[PDB]
Structure 1
Amino acid sequence: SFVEMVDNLRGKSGQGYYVEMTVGSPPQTLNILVDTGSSNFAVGAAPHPFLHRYYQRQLSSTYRDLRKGVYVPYTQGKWEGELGTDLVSIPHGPNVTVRANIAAITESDKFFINGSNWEGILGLAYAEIARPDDSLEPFFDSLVKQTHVPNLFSLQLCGASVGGSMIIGGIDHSLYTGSLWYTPIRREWYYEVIIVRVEINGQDLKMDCKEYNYDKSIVDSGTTNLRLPKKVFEAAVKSIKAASSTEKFPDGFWLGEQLVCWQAGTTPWNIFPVISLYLMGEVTNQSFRITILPQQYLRPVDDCYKFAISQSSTGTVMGAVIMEGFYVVFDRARKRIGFAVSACHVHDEFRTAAVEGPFVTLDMEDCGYN
């Protein structure tokens, strides 16, 4: 049913992926960044030098003021504004119209990005993390309640400027090859999962697995990098350095401070290691792994790249670095996230991104922090 949604996503580099939407009556058109790591629907609603277009409440006859402000701070950027509801559609989405909560963004800081082509943000996670609180129903919850759209969506982010698909209401077999493998959502707030082992070039990092999920581990289409807790990050960087020691790089590279260059075509991919995350599976003592290549974690901007693994103090964030290799299925109805090899992933002639299992892992519940 879903060819109509294929290729409904666009963007630039590490400036997020966006889908076209309409708000209000008559329909105003905006591009909205798709964000599995938050839960507020919000839109530019006033002049800003990075916005070429914005939402104008005056001239929608279906607007309703809710007379309540709201504030949202992210790992990067923050904004405040004014709540209301309005009628909203997704043109290359399902043929439906819904009445959703919408934040009209009045002030903001280091949120909007110059030349980005998007004007708001569609928070696809659960109510538990909506500002101002619980009770502001997120967009997808309204969609599901107000229509007959099944309670799942799936994302295929291609890292080629950049493109992909958001299939709302199901799964499209043309976007992946191999099998889908599934991990439980641990709790409905973020799309929280449990990582149970980490390998770099087939070698185990040998930490207490609690450290991998310290605070929490989440899947987040609105974050660029693979972000890793302090302890895990360093250990990761040590192993990555050693396997690539055949050449040396500035300390500022490993910190994302720098950038690193080679003769167009000549990038020494092979000297760089494969990274595997093992995730909790669906059956007793059962896990599977996702493997990424350096083409995913060295992101391009002589051909030059930035190291897109970085430190975090709020847990693991599996952003675009992770997602670009896979088709990712957010199966809210069964509380699980599926991974499969994406049909648009960047091939090495020697190696591939992979989703593999089953494997056996004991005490998987114990890997989650409390």
Structure 2
Amino acid sequence: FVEMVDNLRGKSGQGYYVEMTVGSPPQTLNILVDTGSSNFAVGAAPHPFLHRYYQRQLSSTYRDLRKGVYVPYTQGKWEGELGTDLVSIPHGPNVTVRANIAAITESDKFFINGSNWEGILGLAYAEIARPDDSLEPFFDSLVKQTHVPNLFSLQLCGASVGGSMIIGGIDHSLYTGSLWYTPIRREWYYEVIIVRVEINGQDLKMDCKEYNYDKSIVDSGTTNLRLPKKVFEAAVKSIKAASSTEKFPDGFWLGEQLVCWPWNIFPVISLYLMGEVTNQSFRITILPQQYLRPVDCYKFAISQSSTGTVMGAVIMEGFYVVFDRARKRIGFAVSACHVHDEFRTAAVEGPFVTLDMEDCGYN
């Protein structure tokens, strides 16, 4: 997998992208890597923000599905035209597959002014694909048409960012210690169940259903750790208390302003995840180095949500994350590239005894 190491690039706050090719002869595009959606969709028209776009007229292997797709999502929208073509990943496995591609022909607040990617690779499951679950996601096509094992793993390393997407396996050099696995509750988003939350080792003591109201997901396409309102409330309260050596405005905690300079006054955040065995859990712990984001000034990168918990880049940059689709589980291990100090490091630890973990899931 050496060839796949360092195959991700990005700019801070604009996501991680991987190089891909589409069509024959191959047209190179940079594509945003997104575990929180399920369509492969690429710019297909000369939008001013784009370095380049898919030109279907130049591809002998393009096939028109003669169907449109309309995709509003919470912070933007794209619309396009469905087709298939040959797709490969130059710094991925040595294969070429026929995949569904949505040629993006209209959009709003989707492309980022100044970014270096031209499309999105939705790595989640068919249940949330648009227009419906009959549009086979890219990764499903890749596994169906090749011998690539049904898993991928992400090391997001965090100004220009970098990382690794290991397609079809695990690179043990990218983590320390052991992987710990939590079940994929349902194959739609990469849905997981958080069974306990601590701030500096202090239990928030909420009914655990609240932690997963209405879901908890692992999402490379979200920057922040997003928490449901009631839990964000309780977590900010405890983090405020833990960091009371210095005072900050109410706006800072709501993302509305920055603060400038101090690590040790800020508490660690621990999420206990449902384990593989009955009544067994493990915990992942991140640092302020993960949830205080550079813009030395910083932004509070934990925010409230109405769509449930989102373990975005703030969580994922602490860990090597294994999307073990074959066994319906997600692995976490301490990342060999995460940012820390001489006093504290991100951790993955277990086993712990946790009862009633099935009650933590929302129905």
**Distance (Å, rounded) in 2 between the aligned partners of 1:110 and 1:294:** 30
Residues 279, 354 of structure 2: 8 Å contact kept: yes
Matches of 2:149 and 2:185, distance apart in 1? 21
The separation in 1 between residues aligned to 2:251 and 2:53, in whole angstroms, is 38
Per the normalisation by structure 1, the TM-score is 0.97
For residues 237 and 159 of structure 2, what CA distance do their matches in structure 1 show? Answer: 29
Can you list the C-alpha shifts for 1:161-211, whole angstroms capped at 9, x where unaligned?
A: 100000000000100000000000000000000000000111111100000
Query: Are the aligned partners of 2:11 and 2:159 in contact in 1 as well (CA < 8 Å)?
Result: no
1:246 & 1:200 partners in 2: Cα distance? 16
Q: What SS class does the counterpart of residue 278 from structure 1 fall into?
A: strand
Gaps of 5+ in 1: 263-267
Contact 2:319–2:334 under 8 Å retained in 1: yes
1:74 Cα deviation after fit: 2.7
Q: How far apart, CA to CA, are the structure 1 residues paired with 2:238 and 2:16? A: 31
State the shift of 1:27 in Å. Answer: 0.6
Give the whole-Å Cα distance in 1 for the aligned partners of 2:177 and 2:73.
35
Displacement of 1:160 in angstroms is 8.0
Offset, 1:257: 1.0
Tell me the alpha carbon deviations over residues 40-82 of structure 1, each in whole angstroms, 9 at most, x when there is no partner. 0000001111112111111111111111111223332211111
Moved more, 335-344 or 45-54: 45-54
Structure 2: how far apart are the matches of 1:75 and 1:307? 21
C-alpha distance in 2, partners of 1:223/1:51?
21
Q: Could you list the runs of 5+ residues in structure 2 that have no partner in the other structure?
A: none
Deviations 1:305-333 (A, max 9, x none): 11100010011110000000100000000
Moved more, 158-167 or 270-279: 158-167
CA deviations 1:213-265 (Å, max 9, x no partner) are 00100000000000000100111111111111111112111111111111xxx
Alignment partners' CA distance in 2, 1:76 and 1:169? 31
Q: Secondary structure at the residue paired with 2:13?
A: coil
CA distance in 2, matches of 1:358, 1:25: 50
| Cα distance in 1 between the residues matched to 2:22 and 2:146 | 17
- 1:98 is paired with a residue whose SS is strand
**2:287 matched residue in structure 1:** 293
Deviates more, 1:118-127 or 1:155-164: 155-164
Counterparts in 2 of 1:219 and 1:276: CA distance versus 1, 3 Å: same
Question: What is the CA–CA distance in structure 1 between the aligned matches of 2:108 and 2:72, rounded to whole Å?
Answer: 10
1:61-107 Cα offsets, whole Å, 9 max, x none, are: 11111111112233322111110000000000000000000001011
SS where residue 164 of structure 2 aligns?
Answer: strand
DSSP 3-state at the match of 2:9:
strand
SS of residue paired to 2:36:
coil
User: For residues 67 and 6 of structure 1, what CA distance do their matches in structure 2 show?
Assistant: 38
Segment drifting more, 43-52 vs 74-83 = 74-83
Q: Which deviations, in whole Å up to 9, do the C-alpha atoms of 1:2-36 show, x marking residues without a partner? A: 10101100000010000000000011000000000
- 1:131-157, Cα deviation, whole Å (9 max, x unpaired): 000100000000000000000000000
Q: Match of 1:349, SS?
A: coil
How far did residue 348 of structure 1 move?
1.1
Stretch deviating more after TM superposition (239-248 or 290-299): 239-248
The percentage of counterpart residues that share the same residue type is 100
CA offset digits 1:268-294 (Å, max 9, x no partner): 100000000000001110000000000
Matches of 1:76 and 1:179 in 2, distance apart?
Answer: 37
Count of residue correspondences: 363
Contact 2:319 2:338 in 1 (8 A): yes
2-side partners of 1:134 and 1:327: how far apart?
29
Contact map agreement 2:4 2:164 (CA 8 A) in 1: yes
Extract structure 1 runs of 4+ deviating beyond 4 A.
none
Find the aligned partners of 1:253 and 1:71 in 2 and give their Cα distance.
Answer: 36
- Name the structure 1 match of 2:273: 279
Distance 1:160 1:325 in 2: 18
Q: Which moved more, 1:149-158 or 1:68-77?
A: 68-77
CA RMSD of aligned residues (A): 0.8
Mapped to 1, the partners of 2:251 and 2:214 lie a distance apart of: 27
Q: TM-score, normalised by structure 2?
A: 0.99
